[PDB]
Design a protein around this nucleic acid. Structure first.
Ligand code: MG
Ligand code: MG
Ligand code: MG
Ligand code: MG
Ligand code: MG
Ligand code: MG
Ligand code: MG
Ligand code: MG
Ligand code: MG
Ligand code: MG
Ligand code: MG
Ligand code: MG
Ligand code: MG
Ligand code: MG
Ligand code: MG
Ligand code: MG
Ligand code: MG
Ligand code: MG
Ligand code: MG
Ligand code: MG
Ligand code: MG
Ligand code: MG
Ligand code: MG
Ligand code: MG
Ligand code: MG
Ligand code: MG
Ligand code: MG
Ligand code: MG
Ligand code: MG
Ligand code: MG
Ligand code: MG
Ligand code: MG
Ligand code: MG
Ligand code: MG
Ligand code: MG
Ligand code: MG
Ligand code: MG
Ligand code: MG
Ligand code: MG
Ligand code: MG
Ligand code: MG
Ligand code: MG
Ligand code: MG
Ligand code: MG
Ligand code: MG
Ligand code: MG
Ligand code: MG
Ligand code: MG
Ligand code: MG
Ligand code: MG
Ligand code: MG
Ligand code: MG
Ligand code: MG
Ligand code: MG
Ligand code: MG
Ligand code: MG
Ligand code: MG
Ligand code: MG
Ligand code: MG
Ligand code: MG
Ligand code: MG
Ligand code: MG
Ligand code: MG
Ligand code: MG
Lengths: 201, 64, 144, 117
RNA sequence: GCUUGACUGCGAGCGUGACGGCGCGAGCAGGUGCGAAAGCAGGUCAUAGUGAUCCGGUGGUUCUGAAUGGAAGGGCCAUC
RNA sequence: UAGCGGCGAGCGAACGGGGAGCAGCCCAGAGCCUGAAUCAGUGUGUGUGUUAGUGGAAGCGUCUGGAAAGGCGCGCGAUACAGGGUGACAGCCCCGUACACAAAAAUGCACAUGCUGUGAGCUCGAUGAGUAGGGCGGGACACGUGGUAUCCUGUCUGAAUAUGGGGGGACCAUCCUCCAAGGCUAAAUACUCCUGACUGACCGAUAGUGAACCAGUACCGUGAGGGAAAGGCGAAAAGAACCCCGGCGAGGGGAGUGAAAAAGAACCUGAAACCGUGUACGUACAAGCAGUGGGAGCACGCUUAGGCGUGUGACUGCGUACCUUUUGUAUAAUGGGUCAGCGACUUAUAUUCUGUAGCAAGGUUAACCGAAUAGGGGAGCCGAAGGGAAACCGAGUCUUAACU
């Protein structure tokens, strides 16, 4: 298949197996939720009955007092006691097979083309590293929420888009499954399409 | 951590082609004059673990 | 395809078994454990192979055999693995470079599994009768 | 993700304390007692749904009996006569005519009298 | 009277057992013993006379033998 | 895994491979040599940080409102839309943030750099003795004395010393490899009393540190030691001038402030148990898990002025709580005075099986590299071949001298 170019009115050819396959919601979902799981810091901890500050003295004798038997001031039943199953810092990252991460991106890229959310331009940059510049540039192109994928990391385009919340500037190697779905439109320079062409293979 | 093999079972059971286990027959270590040859001859080849005892062996040999 | 419109496959996210959370759940009260046993205690349960004190199966049966150290350094090679080598020479060294046998294997044997469809020369590897016929039927030759 | 039980336990306890309105003592203001009262009231209502249909047929039969005997026939002969005459009016309606239409009931007893005789 | 079948290695098929096991078994080899031969003999009319595994002992062995040749040790078979 | 193991419970390597990080040396001593490299100290610089700081963009009108940052309208900044405060939610009100600068003095680091101190090289040498080894008793080696190598030594002894000696898992021969009985040595590695910044599918006052609060305090113990409870007015005290009852009280009613005082300091919200005042109905001839089915009467709301809704419930049928444990409980068997808050199948790794997804005779990487959730990394693991104790054979193999 081929993708039309808005900037130059030419055409660019791409693999059908990358930008033209069927959407795999089951596969895309697993990779997406595994991306959000890898963003978890997972830093937290409660105190078990062994870590609560306090002594091991039995509060009162086993028999004769008329009270329910107790053995520790730190029992999870008691207030100011331990947590029964106190959490530890844990790693929530999942393993995503290489053929699934690449397989999920191909389904995401293919669905962007089907929904007319991926548009290809010959080049995309700003003359000066001013935020007011590409803000005006995106008005001309009629874009509000947009992800720009460039072949090479442009410093002016990166700085000029940093303060725009609904604009994200990446490079062809910094593509992630979530950001492709999370943005209304995706702008790929013709160089960037070639790199993901040979990255997703 | 890794499950630990019951080392005593690994010395007595070997896993065959279709997932079964073969074991050596008991009653052939000593006191053999008083045993008929037919009884001992049938007791020489290895046998397969029965259906009831497969659960207790698979548990003891997680890496079989 | 939005971040709030993609859902898992039907039947791939079976919900966990929450134990001891009321009558209606079917798992309340004892939580699948029954009444008043050792198996119903926290941490209770007998070890692997225990049969109540009767001599367990892995102890009333005799041990047999010995572990051979030569079988740890001997491998078997299939006919379908002969094309994986580079250069058409299936030797002991050209077979480790193709990741066909372990780096510390010293004896290899080519058996009749798969099929040979290219002429290859096998040096120093024992070849079964069935594999020798097939290797020579593809124009290959076997060297001692 | 710690979950606090205050809001949902408040609503679950109020849910049945509202069902325990009118009960005496702790059965209408104490949850532990009110839960048992609400459950027991549910058991009673279920079984009296099935014995409301008996307590009313007993009432109808007794009223048909009383009205038929004023016309010179017992209940057992009255019902048997109605079956012979092929009258399908049931106890709820027979006991309704007996109270609100005395003339129709006695004109209906004579229907059973002829069938038996 | 003569003898050593109170054989060797397998056994279709069965009975019992939760299992470990325990039985009955015609038939195939290889070598026998009685009978003229048809045969029958793998202990005793049958059912009790028993003890798993581990650990070792003794004899044998086309197995293994921690650089290599041996060996020690282990394995397998018979047995205590 | 191989092994060790009342061969039980269990313990559990190494060879080898992939990575991070790599660094070598000098005293068992004399000749020339020459202050020679590598080094330790100190000063002098030249940079770069640390210990204060400086500048730092861009908004107005109108509506509700106690108050605007909110709604609506029109603008501007953005290498600054991190964050915080401001009378409700602020890119443009304030503090900041991106960015660009700054050190009199002290000080870390990195080079150059003189001085002080030791020493670089070539030849000739030499080659750690109560030591290696052994006996006895123990210990460490994954290895529990086992056929047990190897290491350490409490006690007895005890070499060869380079034509020599150690190891290669009893031991011997051959071969290979190395040179003990003398030392030094960075990096990769472990931890956080402490300092700074940042982060959290961590908690939010019975939680989170024992301690959000003048907490290791009050209090308890002779002592070691144990060890709490306890947060929130309001935007701003504007924290109630003054009057009245009262003991020149406590407490309260007005007045006033405030958006709000039923926000009044016992102060946001103000639940439940529990305790009252008022109203409607029932209730002093009536027997029991107190309800439920039927049901009159009374009061009350009606908006078709219509039967219904709501409250009560005379009378009446039926009806001995809940949990647990049990063959079986109203049981006079257990537990619970009630309310509110908390309280019990979790987490990590490994293995097996189901569902689902990707690839498919292949699947997949771990550590690590990489800013990279990418990509590299195929070391390995599982599978495609099994039989046998094993050598070994192989769609066969073992069994047997051989199997129909
Ligand atoms: Mg003590
Ligand atoms: Mg706590
Ligand atoms: Mg990867
Ligand atoms: Mg034996
Ligand atoms: Mg059940
Ligand atoms: Mg119980
Ligand atoms: Mg029991
Ligand atoms: Mg049980
Ligand atoms: Mg326990
Ligand atoms: Mg016993
Ligand atoms: Mg490999
Ligand atoms: Mg929370
Ligand atoms: Mg109430
Ligand atoms: Mg058979
Ligand atoms: Mg003869
Ligand atoms: Mg006899
Ligand atoms: Mg007898
Ligand atoms: Mg024993
Ligand atoms: Mg022993
Ligand atoms: Mg040999
Ligand atoms: Mg050897
Ligand atoms: Mg050796
Ligand atoms: Mg031997
Ligand atoms: Mg290495
Ligand atoms: Mg300033
Ligand atoms: Mg400013
Ligand atoms: Mg106004
Ligand atoms: Mg405004
Ligand atoms: Mg407010
Ligand atoms: Mg010594
Ligand atoms: Mg020795
Ligand atoms: Mg041993
Ligand atoms: Mg030695
Ligand atoms: Mg030595
Ligand atoms: Mg030396
Ligand atoms: Mg040395
Ligand atoms: Mg040292
Ligand atoms: Mg606290
Ligand atoms: Mg609070
Ligand atoms: Mg004191
Ligand atoms: Mg006042
Ligand atoms: Mg006074
Ligand atoms: Mg006063
Ligand atoms: Mg006012
Ligand atoms: Mg209020
Ligand atoms: Mg407030
Ligand atoms: Mg209040
Ligand atoms: Mg209240
Ligand atoms: Mg009255
Ligand atoms: Mg009376
Ligand atoms: Mg009365
Ligand atoms: Mg009474
Ligand atoms: Mg009575
Ligand atoms: Mg009713
Ligand atoms: Mg009754
Ligand atoms: Mg109980
Ligand atoms: Mg009893
Ligand atoms: Mg009863
Ligand atoms: Mg009692
Ligand atoms: Mg009781
Ligand atoms: Mg009690
Ligand atoms: Mg309680
Ligand atoms: Mg469990
Ligand atoms: Mg599948």
């Amino acid at each position: 298949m081929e993708l039309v170019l808005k900037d130059a009115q030419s055409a660019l050819t791409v693999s059908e197996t990358t930008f033209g396959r069927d959407f795999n919601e089951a596969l895309v979902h697993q990779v997406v939720v595994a991306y959000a799981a890898g963003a978890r810091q997972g830093t937290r901890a409660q105190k078990t009955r062994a870590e609560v500050t306090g002594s091991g003295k039995k509060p009162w004798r086993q028999k004769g007092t008329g009270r329910a038997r107790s053995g520790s001031i730190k029992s999870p039943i008691w207030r100011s006691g331990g947590v029964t199953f106190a959490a530890r810092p844990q790693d929530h990252s999942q393993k995503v097979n290489k053929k699934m991460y690449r397989g999920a991106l191909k389904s995401i890229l293919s669905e962007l083309v089907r929904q007319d959310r991926l548009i290809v331009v010959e080049k995309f940059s700003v003359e000066a590293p001013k935020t007011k510049l590409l803000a005006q540039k995106l008005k001309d192109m009629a874009l509000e929420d947009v992800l720009i994928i460039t072949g090479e990391l442009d410093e002016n385009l990166f700085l000029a888009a940093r303060n725009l919340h609904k604009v994200d500037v990446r490079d062809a190697t910094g593509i992630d499954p979530v950001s492709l779905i999370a943005f209304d439109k995706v702008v790929m320079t013709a160089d960037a399409v070639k790199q993901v062409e040979e990255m997703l293979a | 951590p890794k499950i630990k093999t019951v080392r005593g079972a690994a010395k007595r059971f070997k896993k065959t082609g279709k997932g079964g286990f073969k074991h050596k027959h008991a009653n052939l270590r000593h006191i053999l004059t008083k045993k008929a040859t037919k009884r001992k001859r049938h007791l020489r080849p290895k046998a397969m673990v029965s259906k009831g005892d497969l659960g207790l062996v698979i548990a003891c040999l997680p890496y079989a | 395809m939005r971040l709030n419109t993609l859902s898992p496959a039907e039947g791939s996210k079976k919900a966990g078994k929450r134990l001891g959370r009321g009558i209606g759940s079917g798992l309340g009260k004892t939580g699948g454990r029954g009444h008043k046993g050792q198996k119903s205690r926290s941490g209770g349960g007998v070890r692997r192979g225990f049969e109540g004190g009767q001599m367990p199966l892995y102890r009333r049966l005799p041990k047999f055999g010995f572990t051979s150290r030569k079988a740890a350094i001997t491998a078997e090679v299939r006919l379908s693995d002969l094309a994986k080598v580079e250069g058409g020479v299936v030797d002991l060294n050209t077979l480790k470079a193709a990741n066909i046998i372990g780096i510390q294997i010293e004896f290899a044997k080519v058996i009749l599994a798969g099929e040979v469809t290219t002429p290859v020369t096998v040096r120093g590897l024992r070849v079964t009768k069935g594999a020798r016929a097939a290797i020579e039927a593809a124009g290959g030759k076997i060297e001692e | 993700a710690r979950v606090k039980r205050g809001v949902i336990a408040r609503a679950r306890h109020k849910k049945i304390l509202k069902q325990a309105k009118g009960y005496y003592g702790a059965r209408s203001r104490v949850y532990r007692v009110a839960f048992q009262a609400v459950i027991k009231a549910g058991q009673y209502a279920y079984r009296d749904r099935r014995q409301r249909k008996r307590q009313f047929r007993q009432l109808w039969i007794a009223r048909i009996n009383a009205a038929a005997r004023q016309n010179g026939i017992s209940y057992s002969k009255f019902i048997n006569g109605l079956k012979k005459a092929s009258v399908e009016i049931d106890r709820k309606i027979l006991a309704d005519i007996a109270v609100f239409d005395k003339v129709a009931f006695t004109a209906l007893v004579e229907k059973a009298k002829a069938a038996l005789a």
